[PDB]
Design a protein around this ligand. Structure first.
Ligand SMILES: [Cl-]
Ligand SMILES: [Zn+2]
Lengths: 21, 30
């Protein structure tokens, strides 16, 4: 999930947009 | 865009800004 990807590691803007609706 | 570990409410606010009117889903469930 997002925690592992953006909290634990670092996320680009493009990886953040995968969690938009 | 910032290049940093976004956690807690900092990750949620980020999602709000980036998703806009689209809205988003926040499911921390590992
Ligand atoms: Cl903090
Ligand atoms: Zn803080």
């Amino acid at each position: 999930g997002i925690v592992e990807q953006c909290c634990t590691s670092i996320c680009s803007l493009y990886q953040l947009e995968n969690y938009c609706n | 865009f910032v290049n940093q570990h976004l956690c807690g409410s900092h990750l949620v606010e980020a999602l709000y800004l980036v998703c806009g009117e689209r809205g988003f889903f926040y499911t921390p469930k590992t």
